[PDB]
Write a protein that binds this ligand. Structure first.
Ligand code: CLA
Ligand code: CLA
Ligand code: CLA
Ligand code: CLA
Ligand code: CLA
Ligand code: CLA
Ligand code: CLA
Ligand code: DD6
Ligand code: DD6
Ligand code: DD6
Ligand code: BCR
Ligand code: SF4
Ligand code: SF4
Lengths: 131, 73, 82, 169, 86, 119, 216, 79
């Protein structure tokens, strides 16, 4: 019997497949397999089956899709109202120049618009996950 | 039997380091000896940087492809 | 007669693994939020032929859509473009 | 502050050349230099006639350029590149004609290459076919759009060399 | 010294061996190719790094590779004549 | 103003003529030491001793092994033998242990031959 | 079977009948500053004019001829020229400072271009040139910056590792060590400790599964 | 000064010079003492950099080594 190049390639393929499965397994320890490296943090798998998990939302993973949707819509409305009022329909620059203080409501309100945006992406993620 | 592609047929080279990678050549000949690692012989109309026209490839480095059309490499 | 090439000897063509599709490893790509962008397939022009809309106004009939610039075929072309 | 100001004509940094003091002064100085150079030679000289022709050319150039816009400070005619077609010294007309001609050249050439497909024909030109392709390249816009649409223009990247290998094989 | 390596793509045409200026290479019996021989590099200590073997290699990409190592330069790899490190 | 030039009269020479000359002479003397530039010149006793110290340390004693990381080499080997048994061509005399030994071994006697100088 | 010639040191052999008739030049070896030499000895049927690698020309004696040079390169170039003249009996030796003679060029008596039995491939790699492992993959290991010297087994293992580490979704994240449970080395069986480690790993995996299944 | 700048000559820009030097000998001496401390520390640092880490220390050095509790907490947290 002679070990031909085809036989060597077959051995290489079987070795590659089996040992790759082994390395994936817990029996092989490498610096790239630490937390913060390639593998997901234990108990918090971000992507599963090519779909975002609730853990991508961090602390909002326990919020239902319905309440996430309501919060996103409410934050969008309030933040848009605050931004428009601050910028165009109730400008504060003239008052501040005169010496008055801003309308504290508008500044805190305006932050809700990006919060509303991210709350919608969280609502979609939660809904897409069956929650 | 013929292990590799038929003589004269066009094969697309799948060797990443080859000057003709992903382009097609003609199978000049195939070595039927099982002990040859790179039996297939493929010639290309485009000479590489070393002005070499033909090369030897293994059975897994060449796949069967249609003859190049007009303006295709 | 052809000697059946073993699996380990079988070449792995590059065309079989496009950029828009997971590679040989089989790992799904990053999830998309706007839509679940599945593996696209070229069927734009066939769907255009099947679709309703063309009726004698441009001297055309169902299965013969009016598309002089062929903007419906650009979806099929993007498979060859990028 | 108005849509009317979008046009380059209504700009504060430009003025019509016929009304530009700097433009008038520059041309007046060019004419003076040409006349002073002319005065050196004899009246009935061929060089004298040539200088008369050059002076006429300068005057016609001034008359033609009077309509174009030019900056207040330097008074040199400007080229409009906003995209306004109906404006003097517009870049669109030269741009469009050059783009057509350049596409003609490229199409012709690509067509010869596709038809020949041979280094021997590349070296020793098949002049009949070359002239045929040059003549045929006039419909290049329609032909190129049709080929792009139908997939006869670009080939999949898997059919051409991608480059050097960046990973282990 | 430099590193002269040979890969199985070798076809045993001997051009590298014939182009060697300081006789670093030699053909050895093998079964990998039809010529039944593959170039070897036993005397890599004498390799100067001229890459004439690489120039003469026919294969699509070289079946013989010379990796230069400037940190490990020796007198043989430097072709020293007027000075002697031995 | 300028009465501090007495400091300059001592410092400018001492800093730009004396110190550079001493540094150059010391550098020439240092160049001829056994370990001139041990962290960039191969084959130095100091470098070899440092490597041996790292090997002596328990954590790093086998950190230079490319195959390090297998918690259970015996189980890995057993699985590899099972895989090769299933995928074995008919009448194949190639064993997993023998193949692994052959692949691990190679013929490269000119790799880092300067190690002899250090030891 | 091969016999190494005496080849006396050039400083000792001031005048010999073997030396060919050559003009001489300043391109010869510097005798004051170097001691290592290379001697080339051949046999010629007739006196053929040939060019010395060191400067001018020379005439080789009918019979045995011997030349001295500084470098194996010079000796090998002269040997190539002699081969062109069809002189195949030439041999090259390296002469140390102390007179030791090392037979060099026809190492086994057969020219390298001709295949010979008993020759084994050295510095040979069993894969295409691009089969070498990635340099970044073997870092802080034996082959820290020489991926072209890794053994085939190491190349295969590293390749399999890079294939394995693409599947991010199912990769075992190494448990974080409990630094509290540290004891002096002085303070059982290897198999028993491996088994205990395996029980600990299974417990960690079960805990991870429960934690992830809590909210999913 | 003999100015060579067009703007300097035009505008009469000047380089005023004090009557007395800003710092005294004692102040310069104090600064030089601080610089000497810096130099000694820098020579020590250069020696440490040249010799790098010494993993042999666990064989002979006094003590049994120590890791700060915060460092242990960082290790447990991971990267
Ligand atoms: C603790 C930090 C701090 C402090 C003490 C102040 C103080 C002030 N800011 Mg404010 N400011 C801050 C942070 C701070 N700012 C930050 C982080 C930002 C975001 C970039 C701003 C952006 C900002 C703007 C754009 C303006 C002020 C102005 C003012 C004045 C009145 C603001 C007001 O009525 O707010 C209401 C209470 C809350 C006052 C001098 C105004 C000013 O001085 O106008 C002349 C003004 O125009 N601030
Ligand atoms: C933006 C509007 C719009 C869009 C998206 C489409 C889309 C479509 N039309 Mg079109 N169509 C439009 C306006 C539009 N139409 C108008 C206004 C008319 C009246 C002239 C028609 C009349 C018409 C007919 C009679 C037919 C179609 C058909 C089609 C289909 C194939 C052609 C194609 O790819 O079009 C894509 C179109 C675009 C991407 C618009 C690009 C516009 C360019 C960039 C600017 C040109 C402006 C122009 C000068 C005014 C496709 C679903 C055919 C069909 O039903 O096939 C099944 C068909 O038979 N259309
Ligand atoms: C004359 C210059 C020029 C040329 C010859 C090319 C050539 C190419 N480009 Mg393009 N490209 C250009 C300018 C040019 N580009 C410019 C200015 C941009 C904007 C940044 C791009 C942006 C771009 C992208 C993002 C990509 C390409 C790609 C390509 C390749 C495929 C082209 C194709 O399928 O055409 C088909 C053409 C069309 C479908 C559009 C028709 C032409 C337009 C509408 C003309 C509009 C302006 C004109 C005045 C009218 C090819 C190598 C692709 C590539 O590399 O694939 C691997 C790719 O992904 N190009
Ligand atoms: C990013 C730079 C940019 C771009 C892409 C364009 C694009 C365009 N401009 Mg231009 N424009 C620009 C800057 C730019 N402009 C600036 C800075 C100004 C202010 C001076 C203008 C003012 C301006 C005017 C006033 C006009 C254009 C026109 C045009 C069009 C030219 C092609 C055409 O006629 O198509 C359509 C085909 C016919 C096109 C929509 C012209 C246009 O739309 O003509 C129809 C036009 O009237 N532009
Ligand atoms: C068949 C002719 C032809 C065609 C169709 C193209 C097409 C292209 N070239 Mg160009 N190219 C050509 C000849 C041609 N090239 C030649 C001869 C050279 C050598 C100087 C180059 C050097 C070149 C470079 C360095 C680059 C391009 C690029 C490009 C692309 C953008 C256009 C551009 O940059 O133009 C600019 C064109 C030039 C600088 C040189 C043009 C030379 C002449 C004018 C054209 C030759 C015509 C030919 C003789 C026709 C004969 C036909 C007749 C016998 C019937 C595009 C794919 C660019 C690219 O990659 O974009 C993605 C780019 O970077 N080309
Ligand atoms: C200043 C530079 C310049 C200019 C003004 C032109 C102008 C022209 N070239 Mg071009 N050409 C140039 C440089 C230039 N070329 C260069 C450097 C090359 C590379 C050698 C070419 C190669 C070239 C080819 C191969 C062809 C042209 C053609 C043309 C003509 C096409 C448009 C036409 O006939 O419209 C007329 C209708 C309106 C036009 C007269 C085409 C031609 O002559 O067609 C008959 C053509 O096929 N040119
Ligand atoms: C990095 C900052 C720096 C620089 C670039 C200079 C530059 C200069 N100083 Mg010095 N000087 C410095 C800091 C610096 N000084 C400090 C902090 C002090 C206070 C102690 C002095 C006190 C001082 C005096 C009293 C005098 C100078 C003078 C000079 C001149 C000649 C050099 C000399 O005599 O040094 C002497 C000074 C020292 C030896 C003190 C240490 C200087 C610095 C900290 C060294 C930094 C080294 C650098 C980081 C790395 C060097 C690497 C090397 C191996 C190549 C020159 C303009 C002379 C002058 O004015 O001539 C007209 C002069 O009489 N300096
Ligand atoms: C439950 C369900 C469904 C549903 C639903 C339904 C009915 C959804 C309804 C959603 C609804 C009703 C959403 C309103 C948002 C209002 C906003 C954000 C207002 C902002 C308003 C703003 C920012 C206004 C600002 C100001 O103008 C103010 C006020 C006064 C002015 O002086 C000043 C300015 C300009 C600053 C489907 C679709 C049927 C099927 C699905 O499967 C399940
Ligand atoms: C805000 C507001 C108002 C409003 C409003 C709104 C929202 C209005 C919306 C209007 C809208 C949505 C108008 C679309 C037009 C689309 C056209 C013309 C497309 C033509 C496209 C054509 C002709 C394409 C042709 C081709 O592609 C074909 C088919 C096949 C190709 O092969 C070939 C070509 C490329 C040639 C009022 C009502 C004004 C009152 C008041 O002011 C307040
Ligand atoms: C040794 C011994 C013993 C002892 C002892 C005794 C009694 C020892 C006494 C020692 C004594 C009395 C030591 C004074 C030092 C003063 C110094 C260093 C002052 C420096 C001051 C400096 C460097 C200041 C410098 C400047 O800032 C100045 C001022 C002006 C500024 O412009 C800047 C400069 C830099 C110029 C025991 C205890 C009896 C028994 C034991 O068993 C053994
Ligand atoms: C209007 C206007 C303007 C603007 C403009 C713009 C912004 C444009 C854009 C443009 C663009 C953004 C474009 C794109 C493109 C893309 C692509 C993708 C392409 C491609 C191409 C091709 C493919 C071609 C081909 C051909 C032909 C056709 C011919 C010749 C030959 C050849 C082959 C080359 C300005 C201000 C300036 C000026 C004024 C006016
Ligand atoms: S190294 Fe190149 S030239 Fe030498 S035997 Fe191999 S393929 Fe032929
Ligand atoms: S680099 Fe030159 S000396 Fe070295 S092995 Fe190749 S041909 Fe011989």
């Amino acid at each position: 019997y002679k070990e031909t190049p085809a036989d060597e390639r077959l051995f290489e393929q079987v070795y590659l497949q089996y040992t790759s499965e082994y390395m994936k397994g817990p029996m092989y320890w490498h610096k790239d397999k630490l937390q913060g490296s390639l593998p997901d943090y234990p108990g918090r798998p971000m992507i599963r089956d090519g779909k975002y998990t609730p853990y991508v939302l961090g602390n909002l993973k326990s919020f239902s899709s319905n309440e996430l949707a309501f919060l996103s819509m409410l934050f969008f409305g309030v933040g848009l109202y605050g931004n428009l009022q601050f910028n165009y329909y109730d400008p504060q620059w003239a008052k501040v120049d005169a010496g008055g203080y801003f309308n504290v409501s508008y500044i805190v309100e305006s932050l809700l618009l990006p919060i509303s945006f991210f709350m919608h992406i969280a609502c979609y993620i939660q809904k897409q996950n069956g929650k | 039997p013929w292990v590799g592609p038929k003589k004269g047929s066009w094969v697309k080279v799948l060797r990443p380091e080859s000057y003709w990678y992903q382009t097609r050549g003609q199978v000049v000949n195939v070595n039927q000896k099982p002990e040859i690692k790179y039996p297939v012989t493929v010639k290309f109309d485009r000479v590489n940087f070393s002005n070499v026209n033909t090369n030897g490839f293994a059975l897994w480095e060449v796949i069967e492809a249609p003859a190049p059309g007009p303006g295709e490499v | 007669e052809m000697a059946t090439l073993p699996k380990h000897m079988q070449p792995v063509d590059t065309a079989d693994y496009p950029v828009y599709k997971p590679g040989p490893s089989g790992v799904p790509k990053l999830p998309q939020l706007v839509g679940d962008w599945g593996v696209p397939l070229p069927g734009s022009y066939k769907a255009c032929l099947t679709m309703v809309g063309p009726d004698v106004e441009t001297a055309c009939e169902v299965g013969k859509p009016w598309d002089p610039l062929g903007l419906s075929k650009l979806y099929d072309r993007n498979f060859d473009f990028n | 502050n108005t849509p009317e100001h979008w046009t380059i004509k209504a700009s504060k940094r430009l003025e019509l050349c016929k009304d530009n003091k700097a433009y008038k002064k520059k041309f007046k100085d060019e004419l003076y230099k040409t006349e002073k150079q002319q005065k050196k030679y004899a009246t009935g000289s061929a060089v004298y006639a040539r200088f008369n022709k050059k002076i006429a050319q300068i005057k016609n150039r001034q008359e033609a350029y009077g309509d174009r816009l030019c900056g207040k400070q330097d008074g040199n005619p400007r080229v409009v590149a906003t995209g306004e077609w109906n404006v003097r010294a517009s870049v669109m007309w030269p741009a469009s004609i050059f783009l057509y001609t350049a596409g003609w050249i490229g199409w012709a050439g690509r067509s010869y290459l596709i038809r020949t497909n041979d280094e021997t024909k590349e070296l020793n030109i098949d002049v009949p076919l070359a002239l045929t392709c040059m003549a045929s390249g006039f419909s290049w816009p329609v032909a190129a759009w049709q080929e792009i649409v139908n997939g006869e223009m670009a080939v999949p990247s898997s059919q051409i060399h991608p480059g050097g290998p960046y990973t282990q094989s | 010294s430099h590193a002269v390596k040979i890969y199985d793509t070798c076809i045993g045409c001997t051009l590298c061996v014939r182009a060697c200026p300081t006789d670093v290479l030699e053909m050895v019996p093998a079964t990998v190719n039809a010529a039944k021989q593959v170039a070897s590099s036993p005397r890599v200590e004498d390799c100067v790094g001229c890459k004439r073997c690489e120039t003469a290699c026919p294969t699509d990409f070289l079946s013989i590779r010379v990796y230069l190592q400037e940190n490990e330069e020796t007198q043989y790899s430097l072709g020293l004549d007027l000075a002697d490190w031995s | 103003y300028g009465d501090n030039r007495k400091w300059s009269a001592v410092l400018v020479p001492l800093t730009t003529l004396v110190f550079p000359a001493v540094a150059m002479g010391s550098f020439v003397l240092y160049s001829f030491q056994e370990d001139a530039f041990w962290r960039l010149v191969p084959g130095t006793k100091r470098a070899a001793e440092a490597e041996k110290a790292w090997r002596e340390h328990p954590l790093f004693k086998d950190s230079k092994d490319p195959m390090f990381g297998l918690l259970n080499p015996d189980d890995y080997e057993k699985g590899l033998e099972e895989a090769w048994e299933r995928a074995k061509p008919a009448g194949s005399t190639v064993t997993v242990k023998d193949k692994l030994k052959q692949l691990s071994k190679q013929d490269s006697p000119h790799w880092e031959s300067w190690r002899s100088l250090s030891a | 079977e091969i016999v190494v010639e005496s080849i006396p040191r050039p400083e000792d052999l001031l005048e010999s009948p073997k030396f060919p008739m050559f003009e001489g030049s300043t391109g010869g070896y510097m005798s004051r500053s170097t001691r290592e030499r290379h001697a080339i000895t051949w046999t010629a049927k007739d006196q053929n004019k040939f060019e010395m690698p060191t400067g001018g020309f020379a005439i080789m004696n009918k019979g045995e001829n011997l030349c001295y040079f500084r470098k194996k390169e010079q000796c090998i170039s002269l040997g190539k020229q002699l081969r062109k003249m069809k002189i195949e009996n030439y041999k090259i030796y390296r002469l140390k400072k102390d007179g030791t003679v090392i037979f060099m060029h026809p190492a086994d008596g057969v020219f390298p271009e001709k295949v010979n039995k008993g020759r084994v491939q050295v510095n040979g790699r069993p894969f295409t040139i691009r089969g070498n492992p990635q340099q970044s993959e073997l870092k802080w290991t034996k082959y820290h910056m020489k991926s072209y010297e890794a053994d085939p087994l190491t190349t295969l293992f590293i390749k399999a590792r890079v294939m394995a580490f693409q599947d991010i979704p199912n990769l075992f994240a190494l448990p974080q060590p409990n630094m509290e449970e540290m004891v002096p080395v002085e303070e059982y069986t290897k198999q028993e400790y491996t088994t205990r480690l395996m029980e600990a790993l299974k417990r960690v995996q079960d805990d991870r599964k429960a934690k992830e299944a809590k909210s999913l | 000064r003999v100015p060579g700048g067009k703007r300097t000559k035009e505008l009469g820009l000047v380089v005023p010079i004090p009557e007395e030097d800003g710092l005294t000998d004692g102040q310069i001496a104090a600064l030089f003492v601080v610089a000497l401390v810096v130099l000694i520390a820098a020579v020590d640092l250069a020696r440490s950099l040249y010799f790098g880490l010494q993993p042999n220390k666990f064989k002979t050095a006094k003590g049994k080594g120590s890791i700060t509790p915060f460092m242990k907490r960082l290790i447990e947290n991971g990267f």
